[PDB]
Motif scaffolding. Structure first.
Motif, PDB file in Angstrom:
ATOM      1  N   UNK D 217      13.065 -35.454 -36.694  1.00  0.00           N
ATOM      2  CA  UNK D 217      12.944 -33.750 -36.052  1.00  0.00           C
ATOM      3  C   UNK D 217      12.256 -33.560 -36.614  1.00  0.00           C
ATOM      4  N   UNK D 224       3.069 -30.459 -31.768  1.00  0.00           N
ATOM      5  CA  UNK D 224       3.258 -29.582 -30.234  1.00  0.00           C
ATOM      6  C   UNK D 224       2.248 -30.918 -29.438  1.00  0.00           C
ATOM      7  N   UNK D 225       2.576 -30.729 -27.676  1.00  0.00           N
ATOM      8  CA  UNK D 225       1.491 -31.797 -27.145  1.00  0.00           C
ATOM      9  C   UNK D 225       0.678 -30.412 -26.617  1.00  0.00           C
ATOM     10  N   UNK D 260      -1.793 -18.801 -34.684  1.00  0.00           N
ATOM     11  CA  UNK D 260      -2.398 -17.924 -33.685  1.00  0.00           C
ATOM     12  C   UNK D 260      -4.255 -18.020 -34.593  1.00  0.00           C
ATOM     13  N   UNK D 273      -8.287 -22.373 -22.123  1.00  0.00           N
ATOM     14  CA  UNK D 273      -6.778 -22.378 -21.395  1.00  0.00           C
ATOM     15  C   UNK D 273      -6.207 -23.471 -22.431  1.00  0.00           C
ATOM     16  N   UNK D 274      -6.025 -22.372 -23.832  1.00  0.00           N
ATOM     17  CA  UNK D 274      -5.116 -23.439 -24.655  1.00  0.00           C
ATOM     18  C   UNK D 274      -3.696 -23.275 -24.064  1.00  0.00           C
ATOM     19  N   UNK D 275      -3.039 -24.360 -24.604  1.00  0.00           N
ATOM     20  CA  UNK D 275      -1.373 -24.989 -23.410  1.00  0.00           C
ATOM     21  C   UNK D 275      -1.018 -25.183 -24.415  1.00  0.00           C
ATOM     22  N   UNK D 276      -0.423 -24.298 -25.044  1.00  0.00           N
ATOM     23  CA  UNK D 276       0.595 -25.508 -26.862  1.00  0.00           C
ATOM     24  C   UNK D 276       1.957 -25.548 -25.954  1.00  0.00           C
ATOM     25  N   UNK D 277       2.673 -26.929 -25.709  1.00  0.00           N
ATOM     26  CA  UNK D 277       4.640 -27.260 -24.567  1.00  0.00           C
ATOM     27  C   UNK D 277       4.352 -27.845 -26.238  1.00  0.00           C
ATOM     28  N   UNK D 278       6.677 -27.936 -26.230  1.00  0.00           N
ATOM     29  CA  UNK D 278       7.408 -27.962 -27.235  1.00  0.00           C
ATOM     30  C   UNK D 278       7.896 -29.296 -26.831  1.00  0.00           C
ATOM     31  N   UNK D 279       7.708 -30.179 -28.487  1.00  0.00           N
ATOM     32  CA  UNK D 279       7.910 -31.741 -28.549  1.00  0.00           C
ATOM     33  C   UNK D 279       9.601 -31.580 -28.919  1.00  0.00           C
ATOM     34  N   UNK D 280      10.609 -31.606 -28.009  1.00  0.00           N
ATOM     35  CA  UNK D 280      12.365 -31.691 -28.573  1.00  0.00           C
ATOM     36  C   UNK D 280      12.014 -32.627 -29.417  1.00  0.00           C
ATOM     37  N   UNK D 281      11.620 -34.314 -29.082  1.00  0.00           N
ATOM     38  CA  UNK D 281      12.342 -35.043 -30.506  1.00  0.00           C
ATOM     39  C   UNK D 281      10.529 -36.004 -30.230  1.00  0.00           C
ATOM     40  N   UNK D 282      10.734 -36.948 -31.461  1.00  0.00           N
ATOM     41  CA  UNK D 282       9.386 -37.361 -31.088  1.00  0.00           C
ATOM     42  C   UNK D 282       9.706 -39.282 -32.509  1.00  0.00           C
ATOM     43  N   UNK D 283       8.850 -39.850 -32.748  1.00  0.00           N
ATOM     44  CA  UNK D 283       9.061 -41.061 -32.782  1.00  0.00           C
ATOM     45  C   UNK D 283       7.544 -41.739 -33.173  1.00  0.00           C
TER      46      UNK D 283
END
Lengths: 272, 272, 284, 284, 272, 284
Positions: D217, D224-225, D260, D273-283
């Motif tokens: 968590x 972030x992706x 930033x 084109x800086x794109x940051x996408x949220x990761x809900x959960x990972x391992x």
């Protein structure tokens, strides 16, 4: 074993019934639902107002303070449900003034029922509304709302309401007029038919003290520096072998008009 | 320079101590932690009840109203910590009735201690519990809880509690029985050993007024239309060269039984 | 025309759950300080905020077109109306994934056994006497009901009644009141019901639009985008036609939000770089 | 068997932080109206809601297995127990990324200098006298402590004490009370500790399960992706074996949520084109 | 048609004005913005304190209780706006004690104005501050804050404040000293110049009752078991063809010093 | 140096909107219990929490550098100051996508017509008399204003005034008060304004940094990553140089968050597997 007494959990009645009970000489630390008296063998029970008639009717409790409005509503519902409905009324208190009255849009038009022969009426007291309507032979559909009943017309939820009102302030606030008074409610102290062994002795003791405390609350000791003024009810030195009310500037002024000097009103704590 | 007085920030005591102080002739606008009197050279300080003994013990403040329960707890903790523990008690008030008592699961079984020789006891007053246990030679582990101590057994947090109780309502509410009363607390007014110059004059003035206000609070003026009734303590025209209490329907009725007419009870604002 | 009316709880978790879901369905509105009637400026809709008890009856009366309620509340008033010989008809549309609670008979912890048998004399305290009656009648056991509209667990202590049927989510509350749970007499979740009457046409068009977006929102909540540095379809079966291309690691969409347990299970199978990304919204 | 007990604050940000984190660890529970003991239906767990002060002692007493507290609270009661010759032992497991606060000595703004030296007579007001004692003793300075359990900053004004050690996050509060910060005598974050006693086995299995999901968590929050329309590894070093393929623009996973400032820094290097996408959960 | 009376919605004044009005014999159930009297033809209006002078000035309402501070602020603002400013004051009540006073950083230095000739002053009453400054010929920039004005210096928002204060407790709490008292406010009952037909009869009736209730509130009946004590103002049997205040232990003790026995103080409900 | 001061509402949705946006701009702060002045530890910034009414005047006075307010509040005090011949100048920077409300003249529902014409005698009740005056003067109609600072809708009922100009978002409130909306005399959204004075340099550097991150945050909120199992550019025009490669299904970035309606529209065109994923943050 003890005398069980049902009272409202929240609202003015709870305070009115708590305070009066204090005055009746029942010692109890301010309630959190079942309360034991250290002064006498009594237990108060704090519950929703709606639950009170049914609990007395069931005999769960010996004694209960409720509004007549609440009392007839559940009485009729039980009758409809073919449920135990019997109980014993003892005294009607001078607190719990309210009327269930049919109110309509102001600038709306009517002159009695059969103007309401098709309309939807919104109510928290549908059984009481039904009683009156049925007896009037008018036909109707009820909109059951347990809160914000006055907002129903505005909303377009129902054509009319029967709302519990003390004074028109609420109605005028909601842009409605009062059209009929279909029930007059006062708070009454009832007894469980078949909940009751010389606890009846305790009950007589309670009832007697209620009046005495009522007297002291109402009455005031007057002192003041012909007989018409004597017949004004004032009692500095009254006839051997104190006013019931006499609580108004007007009669004070009226006394002043009669030439009354040194008008002194003192509170009576308690009397017989 | 002024007389500093520690009082509870929140709770009934704060009100009781505020009101009594008002009655003692100390003029102060309702408190927001340090308060200055316009009537007299006094400053009230509003703080957590726990902080009060230690501040008087430290001499930070001259004067403090606390429960004996709070007072002995911090007194013992300081002793254990080898901290300054000395102070001067002056008067015990007739407000602050409570007992720290060991309570157990109802339908749980015991008949005195050494039934508690292994159990975990949950308390907000661990030092006071320790004192009693040690003196009884019983061994125990304390579960320190500063809130909802009665829920500990249910939770399975501890085997037993010592809980502050006024009446069993709380305990009965939590499904427990009271088994021992290990401390009897009343609210007491104490003085700082070594916080104190003729402010002692002010202190004597305060103490004297407290009693007078106590009298007026307790006492009532009676008027009523043989000597056994005279020996009933009533005082319409008493012996030249007013009741302490006499506040019960029973004695009113008892008076009525003796043939008493026009029983009038009036409040006494203040007296000496 | 007539606007689409939706009855929702004034207060409680359901009100928030129903408000939030509605937001996700694309319906523009703001509570912006308590008020009984709310208008959406996004769509031709009015929310109505009322006691949960009022909701079945209003739909049954046709006062409102659409209503979210707990099945517990819905059956209670349905049976009471039947007893009162009142209009009881309505149209169920969908049962939501939230509102989880059970009406269950609980007894004094010490008191024990039978647990369904006997109780032919004892007083049971309930806010849901009609639901209690249904179960009791079917069990052929004879009841006396103590009507209490709150603090029902305190009834035994009080000596008000011998037993209760209390609404529980966890049982802590019963545990808190020193009682044991003996039977689960009703299982409740929130359901979305509809007016008994004539559904107009464009209203009903709007209703179909609502239902399909609600499901889509349900899908996006349930479903997540996966990536993992993993050719073993059994692991693919652990993630149920999921495609993508790439030892070899591919980006499948899973139907249902994967559990840490199943996440770990992949790790046990030798899965590396388990990346779960949230899907805001989607449409199968 | 025995359920896993977890002590948490009744009220305050930590309670929410510890509730939310626990939710993200996959533990199903709902506060659903204040109650001291809570059960998870997802896992064999009970949360206990109590004053922060009670927590170290309960773990030390072994009343509860597991407890989240501020290190400040933890050392205070640890030292008080030692002084009282009470059981003081416990097992630390992890120090959380939240609970940031300092116990610091503050003085009347006008009053100045020494700032550690002298203060051999003056009265210091504190809720944490044991922590103050630790620092003072080590400094060889002699103290008089004024015990106040709230509104400690008002002590000087009152003339209750000469100085305070006050818990501060920002200092605004001291600034608000017309005082200056003179020393930071303790640095506190929330830590997760454990019972001193025998950890059973499947309990301890559950504890390992908790700790690894908590870290996972933590990773997803931090990581972030990324995608960007960018062959310059120095920019890749700005994003620390991140792979992907494609002037040329690739989808790397960064360990830590990019600022930033570092976002802008990429733009300065000519990043588009800086794109940051949220990761809900990972391992990992 | 009825007599309209503007009162504060919230605050001590609302209660003070409600209670006094009750004492004046106006029957009204505790307010939710427009209230109708069942006792007499009167309507209370509950509104923000700031709105009151302007509504009376506009003649929207006949009658209004406000602080002089609020009254002069809006009076000056309207003058500046060249707006209708006229009204009729009737009585100044003994409730609503406060001063708008210029306060500065403690350990800050000054001895009168032109020490404030450049500084920024923060105020909720900018017009009242402007009035005083202009008359003093001192130049200044105002920082308009409607709340937490004392925090402005700390914040570095402004160099100084004019803050409404009753006692220094607030100022001392904010680490500031009071330097000038630029306005003395009491709560006053004003009348609408040009809002008003024999309702003036009602107004005279109101004003007369206010004083009588003031007397009863202030005054107490004393009974006690040479002439210097007679000249102490006490009135057991006073001269045929009761104290204004006499509410202090000191004079009680002073009476005790004079040899006074059986000092009994009773409350007077009402008098003339 | 001097820190950058930002005036924000103490209470209301704007305070939260302005707090949250600021959080997303990367500015580290915590309300952590009400206090007038707040410091960011992330950046050299102080937030100031005050009544909305105070904000234009403080910026106009230069007490503070930076302020978020509703245009309604901004013009009202601007005109009042002008009337008072007070300093009225300021620098607007950006108008936010939130604070949507209108000051509109409403009349007794029964009372009707003209709706702008006449009203040359009637009393209008308002908290915004200067804004009402602006519109009335331009309309050449003659007014009497009833100043009320709250519960303005109750004025007619009370007989306090003939009509009101009331701030409305929905109109329910007017509907609630039994009135009709007759004119929209002002359209308000929240705007970010600046001090009239000399902007230093590194302050102004910080201000440019703030504005560009705010826009970036606006973009990420508006924009979503799309994937769909779809060679028809008209559908691509439904999603406005969006690239990506693959009957054929590609991962375009859309400028603005797609509506269910446009989502459905794709489905009508034969779109399958519509996946919308949230963008945390981005920079064009």
């Amino acid at each position: 074993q003890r005398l069980r007494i049902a009272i409202q959990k929240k609202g003015r009645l709870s305070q009115e019934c708590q305070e009066l009970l204090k005055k009746c000489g029942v010692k109890f630390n301010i309630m959190r639902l079942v309360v034991h008296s250290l002064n006498m063998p009594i237990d108060l029970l704090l519950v929703r107002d709606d639950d009170i008639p049914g609990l007395i009717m069931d005999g769960v409790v010996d004694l209960g303070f409720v509004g007549e409005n609440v009392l007839e509503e559940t009485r009729l519902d039980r009758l409809a449900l073919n449920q135990r409905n019997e109980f014993t009324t003892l005294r009607r208190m001078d607190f719990g003034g309210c009327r269930l009255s049919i109110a309509i849009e102001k600038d709306a038009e009517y002159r009695g029922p059969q103007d309401l022969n098709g309309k939807r009426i919104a109510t928290t007291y549908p059984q009481l509304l039904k009683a009156y309507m049925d007896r009037q032979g008018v036909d109707f559909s009820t909109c059951m709302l347990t809160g914000s009943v006055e907002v129903a017309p505005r909303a377009g939820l129902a054509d009319a309401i029967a709302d519990l009102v003390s004074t028109g302030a609420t109605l005028e606030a909601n842009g409605l007029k009062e059209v009929e008074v279909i029930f007059e409610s006062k708070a009454t102290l009832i007894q469980r038919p078949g909940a009751f062994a010389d606890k009846a002795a305790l009950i007589d003791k309670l009832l007697t003290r209620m009046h005495g405390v009522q007297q002291a609350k109402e009455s005031k000791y007057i002192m003041l520096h012909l007989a018409q003024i004597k017949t004004l009810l004032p009692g500095a030195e009254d006839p051997v072998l104190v006013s019931s009310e006499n609580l108004f500037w007007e009669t004070m002024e009226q006394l002043k008009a009669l030439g009354a000097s040194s008008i002194l009103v003192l509170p009576i704590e308690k009397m017989m």
